[PDB]
Amino acid sequence: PMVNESDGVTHALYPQEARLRNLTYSSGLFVDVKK
């Protein structure tokens, strides 16, 4: 789980933080696309 926020780029999001800062405790999904 991370937080892609402005004023910075990205950092790890912990549950208590998300609870307080009203963010979603979600993680990034990446897929390898072939061509």
Place this chain on the structure above:
Amino acid sequence: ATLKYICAECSSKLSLSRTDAVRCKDCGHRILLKARTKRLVQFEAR
């Protein structure tokens, strides 16, 4: 020494102005708490 805000994690007295970055000095943490009045509060021992 001047008291306006405190950090949650590191708990370092911050004291920042309106639009002076919501982050904490030392740890780059955006979680802040307010002072508490110097206006001494009174209660009934009941």
